[PDB]
Design a protein around this ligand. Structure first.
Ligand SMILES: N=c1nc2c3c(NCCO)cc(F)cc3nc(Cc3ccc4c(c3)OCO4)n2[nH]1
Length: 209
């Protein structure tokens, strides 16, 4: 059963701005997604400090980057706290609305698209490089869900019956035809070294077969 939802007007506007604005410094999407992973990992780590059983769904706290040339996807996987259905339907939309308003105001005051992450909407930088984004997520005491959107004003959510992930978030970027540079080992290594050198969790860049 697949449910389709409308983005709030302000979030659709943000996505169209990201998709339509001429802006060459697209590589920052990776910094933003890795930063999101670090935050999700910090959250589960903090919870585990007072309740060790929070890690029953997996003790390892890390990030995997997985390029796949055949599927034309770059996947960012973390074992962080994950997301509830309420996150995907209501919570992150409430945060995105106020964050978008502030991001828009900053852009008018001379800020640039790379500063998106400072407004709690860095996730949407994925649309700088991806035609479709699929997110698989699992939070303790909630079911595994797949969220998906190719923008255009709507997203879907379904309960995911594919491979179980234990706990965390997996962002699958279906890359635009002209953005396949972010599948090259040398390029990903460069971007990670440049923007994500002090992340407090292992980042493993998988090699392609
Ligand atoms: N403003 C954001 N929106 C998302 C976000 C998202 N938004 C569309 C929901 O209908 C879908 C998704 F699959 C992952 C996301 N992942 C993130 C990153 C994030 C940030 C804070 C969080 C979070 C995830 O989960 C709990 O608190 N965001 N941030």
């Amino acid at each position: 059963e697949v449910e389709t939802f409308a983005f709030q007007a302000e979030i659709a506007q943000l996505m169209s701005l990201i998709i339509n604005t001429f802006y060459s410094n697209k590589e920052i999407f990776l910094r933003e997604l890795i930063s999101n992973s670090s935050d999700a990992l910090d959250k589960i780590r903090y919870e585990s400090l007072t309740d060790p059983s929070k890690l029953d769904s997996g003790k390892e706290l890390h990030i995997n980057l997985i390029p796949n040339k055949q599927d034309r996807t770059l996947t960012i996987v973390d074992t962080g706290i994950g997301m509830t259905k309420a996150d995907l339907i209501n919570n992150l939309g409430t945060i995105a609305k106020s964050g978008t308003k502030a991001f828009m105001e900053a852009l008018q005051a001379g800020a640039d698209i790379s500063m998106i992450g400072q407004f709690g909407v860095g996730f949407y930088s994925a649309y700088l490089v991806a035609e479709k984004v699929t997110v698989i997520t699992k939070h303790n005491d909630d079911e595994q869900y797949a969220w998906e959107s190719s923008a255009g004003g709507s997203f879907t959510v379904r309960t995911d019956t594919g491979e179980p992930m234990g706990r965390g978030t997996k962002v699958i970027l279906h890359l635009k035809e002209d953005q396949t540079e972010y599948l090259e080992e040398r390029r990903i290594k460069e971007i990670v070294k440049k923007h994500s050198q002090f992340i407090g969790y292992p980042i493993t860049l998988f090699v392609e077969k």
